[PDB]
């Protein structure tokens, strides 16, 4: 291979210049299957890569793993291999009461509560999505009939204290994050996740295009628990949206 971690050569990509980048390698094949000629390329650690074809153009699907440091490796190596457009697909919880399970979130920019982004741009620089990618994602969502929210996501280097969770071993949240959730809610932040600050900052500062869509599978501010298909139907829809957006970006 010609990259450190992904175990891929440039020829494996067959000239692909767009990648769909879910977090979980288990989600990779399912996304690749929506497209033509799904072919598994490689699998190393949490980096599972498949190649497929969309309207006659090669497309890559590759997992990022959890967190900014893992994500930065995936993105940088994929960019080395010629990828110029990155579409993140995820499932997420929401932190706004009016956002319902089954809804779709498209992120215009992220709150940079991480560290890896700082290696690519100073904090003053916005973790902003590319306009064409965001447009494609919003339009694909509309095409599917999805109830869609477009706005800011909080991107945290932790799942627990950075998302102000108290149901933990210590039950403690450090001063920086005490009361932070209510502050992000008041500022209209839609949800938390862990990878987008890195993805968006590194792309926006390096001439690459990125966008992010996620299906809401839980809402910790609603007391109703998510249905049996707490994920499934919504996960399916989010995947459909990301593939349809990729079709408009080729």
Segment 203-222, which members bind a second copy (CB under 8 A)?
A: 204-208
Alpha helices for 51-147 (secondary structure H): 68-80, 131-144
Question: In degrees to the nearest 10, what's the CA dihedral of 154, 211, 141, 58?
Answer: -150
Catalytic site includes residue 237? no
Catalytic site includes residue 98? no
Residue closer to a second copy, measured from CB, 33 or 121? 121
What does the block give as tokens for 226? 């998510």
Catalytic site includes residue 119? no
Q: Which of 177, 219, 242, 244: binder of a second copy (CB under 8 A)?
A: 177
Binding of residue 225 to a second copy (CB under 8 A): no
Q: Given the rule CB under 8 A, which of 9-17, 59-67, 223-231, 233-241 is the region that contacts a second copy?
A: 59-67
Tell me the site size for a second copy, rule CB under 8 A: 76
Please give the distance of CA 92 from its chain centroid, rounded to a whole number. Answer: 10
Q: Which of 44, 98, 176, 220 is catalytic?
A: 220
Residue closer to a second copy, measured from CB, 135 or 233? 135
Q: Which residue has the tokens 């904090």?
A: 123
Segment 5-44, which members bind a second copy (CB under 8 A)?
A: 5, 23-26
Catalytic site includes residue 77? yes
Which residues is 42 bridged to in the sheet?
49
Q: Given the rule CB under 8 A, which of 10-18, 51-59, 165-173, 236-244 is the region that contacts a second copy?
A: 165-173
Measured at the CA of 83, the angle between CA 240 and CA 235, to 5 degrees, comes to 20
CB of 28: closest distance to a second copy in angstroms? 12
Q: Which of 27, 51, 77, 164 is catalytic?
A: 77
CB of 37: closest distance to a second copy in angstroms? 26
Binding of residue 236 to a second copy (CB under 8 A): no
Number of other residues whose CB lies within 10 A of the CB of residue 128: 17
- Sequence-distant contacts of 223-226: CB under 8 A, at least 24 apart: 226/101
Please give the distance of CA 8 from its chain centroid, rounded to a whole number. Answer: 21
Q: What gap in Å lies between CA 22 and CA 195, rounded to an integer? A: 10
Q: Which of 67, 90, 211, 215: binder of a second copy (CB under 8 A)?
A: 67
Q: Which of 84, 165, 247, 248 is catalytic?
A: 165
Binding of residue 79 to a second copy (CB under 8 A): yes
Binding of residue 231 to a second copy (CB under 8 A): no
Q: What gap in Å lies between CA 205 and CA 210, rounded to an integer? A: 11
Task: Collapse the DSSP code of 44 into the 3-class scheme (helix H, G, I; strand E, B; otherwise coil) and give the result.
Answer: strand
What does the block give as tokens for 145? 């009939």
The residues assigned a catalytic role are 5, 77, 165, 220
């Amino acid at each position: 291979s010609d990259v450190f971690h992904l175990g891929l050569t440039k020829n494996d990509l067959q000239g692909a210049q767009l990648a769909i980048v879910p977090g979980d390698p288990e989600r990779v094949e399912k996304i690749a299957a929506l497209m033509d000629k799904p072919v598994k390329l490689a699998s190393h650690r949490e980096f599972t890569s498949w190649r497929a074809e969309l309207d006659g153009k090669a497309v890559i699907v590759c997992s990022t793993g959890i967190g900014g440091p893992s994500t930065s490796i995936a993105v940088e190596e994929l960019a080395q291999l010629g990828i110029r457009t990155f579409l993140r697909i995820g499932t997420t919880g929401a932190i706004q009461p009016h956002i319902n399970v089954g809804d779709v979130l498209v992120t215009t920019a992220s709150v940079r509560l991480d560290g890896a982004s700082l290696h690519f741009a100073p904090m003053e620089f916005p973790a902003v999505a590319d306009f064409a990618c965001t447009t494609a994602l919003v339009e694909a969502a509309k095409s599917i009939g999805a109830t869609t929210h477009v706005g800011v996501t909080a991107s945290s280097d932790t799942f627990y204290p950075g998302q102000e969770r108290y149901d933990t071993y210590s039950g403690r949240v450090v001063r920086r994050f005490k009361g932070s959730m209510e502050e992000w809610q008041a500022m209209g932040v839609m949800n938390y996740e862990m990878e987008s600050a890195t993805l968006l900052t590194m792309c926006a500062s390096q001439g690459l295009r990125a966008g992010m869509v996620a299906g809401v599978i839980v809402n910790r501010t609603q007391q109703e628990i998510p249905n049996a298909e707490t994920m499934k139907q919504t996960e399916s829809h989010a995947v459909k949206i990301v593939v349809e957006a990729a079709r408009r970006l080729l």
